[PDB]
CSV table of C-alpha atoms (C1' of nucleotides) in Angstrom, one decimal:
chain,number,residue,atom,x,y,z
A,159,UNK,CA,0.0,0.0,0.0
A,160,UNK,CA,1.0,3.6,-0.7
A,161,UNK,CA,-1.1,6.8,-1.0
A,162,UNK,CA,0.0,10.0,-2.8
A,163,UNK,CA,-1.3,13.3,-4.1
A,164,UNK,CA,-2.4,13.8,-7.8
A,165,UNK,CA,-2.4,16.9,-10.1
A,166,UNK,CA,-5.7,17.9,-8.4
A,167,UNK,CA,-6.1,19.1,-4.8
A,168,UNK,CA,-7.3,16.6,-2.1
A,169,UNK,CA,-7.5,13.8,-4.6
A,170,UNK,CA,-5.1,10.8,-4.2
A,171,UNK,CA,-4.2,7.4,-5.7
A,172,UNK,CA,-3.3,4.1,-4.1
A,173,UNK,CA,-0.7,1.6,-4.9
A,174,UNK,CA,-2.2,-1.7,-3.6
A,175,UNK,CA,-1.1,-4.9,-1.8
A,176,UNK,CA,-1.6,-6.4,-5.3
A,177,UNK,CA,-0.6,-3.6,-7.6
A,178,UNK,CA,-3.9,-1.9,-8.6
A,179,UNK,CA,-4.5,1.8,-8.7
A,180,UNK,CA,-7.7,3.3,-7.2
A,181,UNK,CA,-8.8,6.9,-6.6
A,182,UNK,CA,-9.6,8.2,-3.1
A,183,UNK,CA,-10.3,11.3,-1.1
A,184,UNK,CA,-9.3,12.5,2.4
A,185,UNK,CA,-12.0,11.5,4.8
A,186,UNK,CA,-13.6,14.5,6.4
A,187,UNK,CA,-15.5,12.2,8.9
A,188,UNK,CA,-12.9,9.5,9.8
A,189,UNK,CA,-14.2,5.9,10.6
A,190,UNK,CA,-17.4,6.6,8.6
A,191,UNK,CA,-18.4,5.6,5.0
A,192,UNK,CA,-21.4,6.8,2.9
A,193,UNK,CA,-22.0,3.9,0.5
A,194,UNK,CA,-20.0,0.6,1.1
A,195,UNK,CA,-16.6,2.1,0.2
A,196,UNK,CA,-13.3,0.9,1.6
A,197,UNK,CA,-11.7,3.0,4.3
A,198,UNK,CA,-7.9,3.2,4.1
A,199,UNK,CA,-5.3,4.4,6.7
A,200,UNK,CA,-1.9,5.4,5.5
A,201,UNK,CA,0.6,7.3,7.7
A,202,UNK,CA,-2.1,7.8,10.3
A,203,UNK,CA,-4.5,9.6,7.8
A,204,UNK,CA,-7.8,8.1,6.5
A,205,UNK,CA,-8.9,8.0,2.9
A,206,UNK,CA,-12.2,7.0,1.2
A,207,UNK,CA,-12.0,4.9,-1.9
A,208,UNK,CA,-13.6,6.6,-4.8
A,209,UNK,CA,-15.3,4.1,-7.0
A,210,UNK,CA,-15.5,5.3,-10.7
A,211,UNK,CA,-18.3,3.0,-11.5
A,212,UNK,CA,-20.6,4.9,-9.1
A,213,UNK,CA,-19.3,8.5,-9.2
A,214,UNK,CA,-19.3,10.2,-12.6
A,215,UNK,CA,-16.8,12.7,-11.3
A,216,UNK,CA,-14.2,10.0,-10.6
A,217,UNK,CA,-15.1,8.6,-13.9
A,218,UNK,CA,-14.4,11.9,-15.6
A,219,UNK,CA,-11.1,12.1,-13.8
A,220,UNK,CA,-10.0,8.6,-14.9
A,221,UNK,CA,-10.9,9.7,-18.5
A,222,UNK,CA,-8.4,12.5,-18.3
A,223,UNK,CA,-10.3,15.6,-17.1
A,224,UNK,CA,-7.8,18.4,-17.8
A,225,UNK,CA,-8.2,20.6,-14.7
A,226,UNK,CA,-10.7,20.0,-11.9
A,227,UNK,CA,-12.5,23.2,-10.7
A,228,UNK,CA,-13.6,21.5,-7.5
A,229,UNK,CA,-10.9,22.0,-4.9
A,230,UNK,CA,-10.1,23.2,-1.3
A,231,UNK,CA,-12.7,25.7,-0.2
A,232,UNK,CA,-14.8,25.7,-3.4
A,233,UNK,CA,-18.4,26.7,-3.3
A,234,UNK,CA,-20.5,24.2,-5.4
A,235,UNK,CA,-24.2,24.1,-6.4
A,236,UNK,CA,-24.9,20.4,-7.0
A,237,UNK,CA,-28.1,19.7,-9.0
A,238,UNK,CA,-29.3,16.1,-8.6
A,239,UNK,CA,-27.5,15.2,-5.3
A,240,UNK,CA,-29.5,11.9,-5.1
A,241,UNK,CA,-28.4,9.5,-2.3
A,242,UNK,CA,-25.1,11.4,-1.7
A,243,UNK,CA,-22.5,9.1,-3.4
A,244,UNK,CA,-20.7,11.7,-5.5
A,245,UNK,CA,-21.5,14.8,-3.3
A,246,UNK,CA,-19.9,13.1,-0.4
A,247,UNK,CA,-16.7,13.0,-2.3
A,248,UNK,CA,-16.9,16.7,-3.3
A,249,UNK,CA,-17.5,17.3,0.4
A,250,UNK,CA,-14.1,15.6,1.1
A,251,UNK,CA,-12.4,17.6,-1.6
A,252,UNK,CA,-13.8,20.9,-0.7
A,253,UNK,CA,-13.2,20.6,3.1
A,254,UNK,CA,-14.8,22.6,6.0
A,255,UNK,CA,-13.9,25.9,4.2
A,256,UNK,CA,-16.0,25.4,1.1
A,257,UNK,CA,-19.7,24.6,0.8
A,258,UNK,CA,-22.0,22.3,-1.2
A,259,UNK,CA,-25.6,22.9,-1.8
A,260,UNK,CA,-27.3,19.6,-2.8
A,261,UNK,CA,-30.5,20.0,-4.8
A,262,UNK,CA,-32.7,16.9,-5.1
A,263,UNK,CA,-36.4,16.5,-5.6
A,264,UNK,CA,-37.0,12.8,-4.9
A,265,UNK,CA,-38.0,12.3,-1.2
A,266,UNK,CA,-37.5,8.5,-1.3
A,267,UNK,CA,-33.8,9.4,-1.9
A,268,UNK,CA,-33.3,12.7,0.0
A,269,UNK,CA,-34.2,10.3,2.9
A,270,UNK,CA,-30.7,8.9,2.6
A,271,UNK,CA,-29.1,12.2,1.7
A,272,UNK,CA,-30.1,13.5,5.1
A,273,UNK,CA,-27.9,10.9,6.8
A,274,UNK,CA,-24.9,11.9,4.7
A,275,UNK,CA,-25.5,15.6,5.3
A,276,UNK,CA,-26.0,15.3,9.0
A,277,UNK,CA,-22.5,13.9,9.5
A,278,UNK,CA,-21.2,16.6,7.1
A,279,UNK,CA,-21.1,20.4,7.8
A,280,UNK,CA,-20.0,21.0,4.2
A,281,UNK,CA,-23.4,19.9,2.8
A,282,UNK,CA,-26.6,21.8,2.7
A,283,UNK,CA,-29.4,19.4,1.5
A,284,UNK,CA,-32.4,20.8,-0.4
A,285,UNK,CA,-35.6,18.9,-1.2
A,286,UNK,CA,-36.5,21.1,-4.2
A,287,UNK,CA,-37.1,20.9,-7.9
A,288,UNK,CA,-34.1,22.3,-9.8
A,289,UNK,CA,-36.5,23.7,-12.5
A,290,UNK,CA,-37.5,26.4,-9.9
A,291,UNK,CA,-34.4,27.9,-8.4
A,292,UNK,CA,-36.8,30.5,-6.8
A,293,UNK,CA,-37.7,27.8,-4.3
A,294,UNK,CA,-34.1,27.6,-3.0
A,295,UNK,CA,-33.0,31.2,-3.9
A,296,UNK,CA,-33.4,32.0,-0.2
A,297,UNK,CA,-30.9,29.5,1.2
A,298,UNK,CA,-28.0,29.4,-1.3
A,299,UNK,CA,-25.3,31.9,-2.3
A,300,UNK,CA,-23.5,32.4,-5.6
A,301,UNK,CA,-21.0,29.6,-6.4
A,302,UNK,CA,-17.8,28.6,-8.3
A,303,UNK,CA,-19.0,25.3,-9.6
A,304,UNK,CA,-22.4,24.2,-11.0
A,305,UNK,CA,-22.2,20.4,-10.9
A,306,UNK,CA,-25.2,19.1,-12.8
A,307,UNK,CA,-26.3,15.5,-12.9
A,308,UNK,CA,-30.0,15.5,-13.4
A,309,UNK,CA,-32.2,13.0,-15.2
A,310,UNK,CA,-34.4,15.3,-17.3
A,311,UNK,CA,-35.1,15.7,-21.1
A,312,UNK,CA,-34.5,19.5,-20.7
A,313,UNK,CA,-31.6,18.9,-18.3
A,314,UNK,CA,-29.4,21.3,-20.2
A,315,UNK,CA,-31.9,24.2,-20.2
A,316,UNK,CA,-32.5,23.6,-16.4
A,317,UNK,CA,-28.7,23.8,-15.9
A,318,UNK,CA,-28.4,27.1,-17.8
A,319,UNK,CA,-31.3,28.6,-15.8
A,320,UNK,CA,-29.6,27.8,-12.5
A,321,UNK,CA,-26.4,29.1,-13.9
A,322,UNK,CA,-27.7,32.7,-14.5
A,323,UNK,CA,-29.1,32.5,-11.0
A,324,UNK,CA,-26.2,31.1,-9.0
A,325,UNK,CA,-23.0,30.7,-11.1
A,326,UNK,CA,-20.3,33.3,-10.7
A,327,UNK,CA,-19.1,34.9,-13.9
A,328,UNK,CA,-16.0,32.9,-14.9
A,329,UNK,CA,-17.3,30.1,-12.7
A,330,UNK,CA,-17.3,26.5,-14.1
A,331,UNK,CA,-20.1,24.1,-14.9
A,332,UNK,CA,-19.7,20.3,-14.9
A,333,UNK,CA,-22.8,19.1,-16.9
A,334,UNK,CA,-23.5,15.4,-17.1
A,335,UNK,CA,-25.3,14.7,-20.4
A,336,UNK,CA,-27.5,11.6,-20.1
A,337,UNK,CA,-28.4,10.6,-23.7
A,338,UNK,CA,-30.9,7.9,-22.9
A,339,UNK,CA,-33.0,10.2,-20.6
A,340,UNK,CA,-33.0,13.0,-23.1
A,341,UNK,CA,-34.1,10.6,-25.9
A,342,UNK,CA,-33.7,6.9,-26.0
A,343,UNK,CA,-34.4,6.9,-29.8
A,344,UNK,CA,-31.6,9.4,-30.9
A,345,UNK,CA,-27.9,8.5,-31.1
A,346,UNK,CA,-26.1,9.4,-27.9
A,347,UNK,CA,-23.5,11.1,-30.1
A,348,UNK,CA,-26.0,13.4,-31.8
A,349,UNK,CA,-27.3,14.4,-28.4
A,350,UNK,CA,-23.8,15.4,-27.1
A,351,UNK,CA,-23.3,17.7,-30.0
A,352,UNK,CA,-26.7,19.4,-29.8
A,353,UNK,CA,-26.7,20.0,-26.0
A,354,UNK,CA,-23.2,21.5,-26.2
A,355,UNK,CA,-24.5,23.9,-28.8
A,356,UNK,CA,-27.1,25.1,-26.3
A,357,UNK,CA,-24.4,25.9,-23.9
A,358,UNK,CA,-22.4,27.7,-26.6
A,359,UNK,CA,-25.6,29.5,-27.8
A,360,UNK,CA,-26.0,30.8,-24.3
A,361,UNK,CA,-22.5,31.8,-23.5
A,362,UNK,CA,-20.6,28.9,-22.0
A,363,UNK,CA,-17.1,28.3,-23.3
A,364,UNK,CA,-16.6,24.6,-23.8
A,365,UNK,CA,-13.3,23.6,-22.2
A,366,UNK,CA,-13.4,19.8,-22.4
A,367,UNK,CA,-15.9,17.1,-23.5
A,368,UNK,CA,-15.5,13.6,-22.0
A,369,UNK,CA,-17.2,10.3,-22.8
A,370,UNK,CA,-17.8,8.4,-19.6
A,371,UNK,CA,-17.5,4.9,-21.2
A,372,UNK,CA,-16.5,1.8,-19.4
A,373,UNK,CA,-17.8,3.6,-16.3
A,374,UNK,CA,-21.2,5.0,-17.6
A,375,UNK,CA,-23.0,3.9,-20.8
A,376,UNK,CA,-24.5,6.6,-23.1
A,377,UNK,CA,-23.2,9.4,-20.9
A,378,UNK,CA,-20.9,12.4,-21.5
A,379,UNK,CA,-19.7,15.2,-19.2
A,380,UNK,CA,-19.0,18.8,-20.3
A,381,UNK,CA,-16.7,21.2,-18.6
A,382,UNK,CA,-17.2,24.8,-19.7
A,383,UNK,CA,-16.9,28.4,-18.4
A,384,UNK,CA,-19.7,30.8,-17.8
A,385,UNK,CA,-19.2,34.4,-19.1
B,137,C,C1',-71.0,-69.1,-19.3
B,138,C,C1',-72.9,-64.6,-20.0
B,139,A,C1',-75.4,-60.7,-17.8
B,140,C,C1',-75.1,-56.7,-14.5
B,141,A,C1',-73.1,-54.4,-10.5
B,142,G,C1',-69.1,-52.5,-7.9
B,143,A,C1',-65.3,-49.3,-7.1
B,144,U,C1',-60.5,-47.9,-8.8
B,145,C,C1',-57.8,-46.1,-12.4
B,146,C,C1',-57.1,-43.1,-15.8
B,147,C,C1',-58.7,-41.1,-19.8
B,148,A,C1',-60.5,-35.9,-21.8
B,149,C,C1',-63.5,-32.5,-21.5
B,150,C,C1',-65.6,-29.9,-17.4
B,151,C,C1',-64.7,-26.4,-12.8
B,152,G,C1',-61.5,-24.2,-9.7
B,153,G,C1',-55.8,-23.4,-9.0
B,154,G,C1',-53.5,-20.4,-11.7
B,155,U,C1',-50.0,-15.7,-14.4
B,156,U,C1',-51.6,-12.0,-7.6
B,157,G,C1',-47.5,-19.2,-7.5
B,158,A,C1',-47.4,-26.0,-8.7
B,159,U,C1',-43.3,-28.4,-7.0
B,160,G,C1',-40.3,-30.3,-3.7
B,161,A,C1',-36.9,-27.9,-0.6
B,162,A,C1',-33.3,-29.8,7.4
B,163,C,C1',-35.5,-23.9,12.4
B,164,G,C1',-34.7,-21.4,16.4
B,165,A,C1',-36.8,-12.8,18.1
C,193,G,C1',19.5,0.4,82.7
C,194,A,C1',14.0,0.0,79.1
C,195,G,C1',12.1,-0.8,73.8
C,196,U,C1',13.1,-2.0,68.6
C,197,G,C1',14.0,-3.7,64.6
C,198,G,C1',16.1,-9.9,61.9
C,199,C,C1',16.5,-15.4,55.6
C,200,G,C1',12.6,-19.4,55.7
C,201,A,C1',6.0,-24.2,54.0
C,202,U,C1',2.8,-19.6,57.6
C,203,G,C1',7.1,-21.6,51.0
C,204,A,C1',13.2,-20.0,46.7
C,205,U,C1',13.6,-22.6,41.2
C,206,C,C1',11.7,-24.1,36.0
C,207,U,C1',9.0,-22.5,31.1
C,208,G,C1',5.4,-18.5,28.9
C,209,U,C1',13.4,-18.5,27.3
C,210,A,C1',8.5,-15.0,22.2
C,211,C,C1',11.8,-12.5,17.6
C,212,C,C1',15.5,-9.8,17.0
C,213,C,C1',16.7,-4.7,17.6
C,214,C,C1',19.3,0.1,20.0
C,215,G,C1',21.3,1.8,24.2
C,216,G,C1',22.1,-9.0,32.6
C,217,C,C1',18.9,-4.5,32.1
C,218,G,C1',16.0,0.3,29.6
C,219,G,C1',13.4,1.0,25.3
C,220,G,C1',11.7,-0.7,20.7
C,221,G,C1',9.2,-3.1,17.5
C,222,U,C1',7.5,-8.3,15.2
C,223,G,C1',4.9,-12.8,18.1
C,224,G,C1',1.4,-16.0,20.7
C,225,G,C1',-3.3,-16.8,22.4
C,226,U,C1',-6.6,-14.7,25.3
C,227,G,C1',-10.9,-10.1,27.3
C,228,U,C1',-13.8,-6.4,24.7
C,229,C,C1',-16.4,-4.9,20.8
C,230,G,C1',-16.4,-3.3,16.0
C,231,A,C1',-16.1,-2.8,10.9
C,232,U,C1',-19.3,-3.1,6.1
C,233,G,C1',-15.1,-6.6,6.5
C,234,G,C1',-15.0,-12.8,3.9
C,235,A,C1',-18.9,-17.2,3.0
C,236,A,C1',-23.3,-21.6,-5.6
C,237,G,C1',-25.1,-15.5,-1.4
C,238,U,C1',-30.1,-15.2,-0.8
C,239,C,C1',-35.3,-22.3,-4.5
C,240,U,C1',-37.5,-24.0,-8.4
C,241,G,C1',-40.5,-23.4,-12.6
C,242,A,C1',-44.8,-27.7,-15.7
C,243,C,C1',-48.6,-27.9,-15.8
C,244,C,C1',-51.8,-28.2,-9.7
C,245,G,C1',-55.9,-30.2,-8.1
C,246,G,C1',-62.0,-30.8,-7.9
C,247,C,C1',-64.9,-32.9,-10.9
RNA sequence: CCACAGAUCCCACCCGGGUUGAUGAACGA
RNA sequence: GAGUGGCGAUGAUCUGUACCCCGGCGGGGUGGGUGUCGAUGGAAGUCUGACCGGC
């Protein structure tokens, strides 16, 4: 075993007893895991193993995401927080300084998000519909990163709408494009092109476009900058 | 010896089972 | 001149030589099994489908 820093703040890799390499984050709440993930101690510091198959952000990293705009003390608005798998990892990355506002409109699921956000001062859960930022306007601030993973046909439009509400100028947006929930009939690759055009036809400046394959089928993630 | 009975067996329908479980399957608030 | 303090059944040794280490000893780690509990940890990991009867 060995753990060491990567190009990106508070994100680390492990050399393993066998010789595999897995991503991990520095555990903000030591002894405690959110999904079933492995806890690893090295030189008396505890890391949480970041499974790429579950977290699209880890997936994006392993698919060579240039620069990660989520770091120490970053303010992120996180649309589609779901059960808290990925958002827990951005909690770790961001540390007590930065803040993460987790928007999620499915109660059956915010149920389990609560448990994550109780243990974590970083995370401000919100049972609200991301199509109406008016209904959480009164709790959030402006932000550096708009991380958007929402299952919706008009997911791109929703994201833009939130952006002009809460995204700082020169802030970054990580937008997960879910082809099969925008249209199961269309070709995933046509969809990626047309949704990126929406961002450009607003004024987002496409920085990097990644295809999340192995890890996520018919998905892509866009990193771009709001102007 | 036949006749006729008997009940069984199916045998197939018939019904219910039954698409909201037939089966068999060794326990321990 | 008076009182105290003096081996020993009313009881020494042998083995948990742990490893080896740095300074017989100090400290160190690695060990054993054992007390606690835990983790989430690890366990063909989670039955079966042709026709069941009543008549």
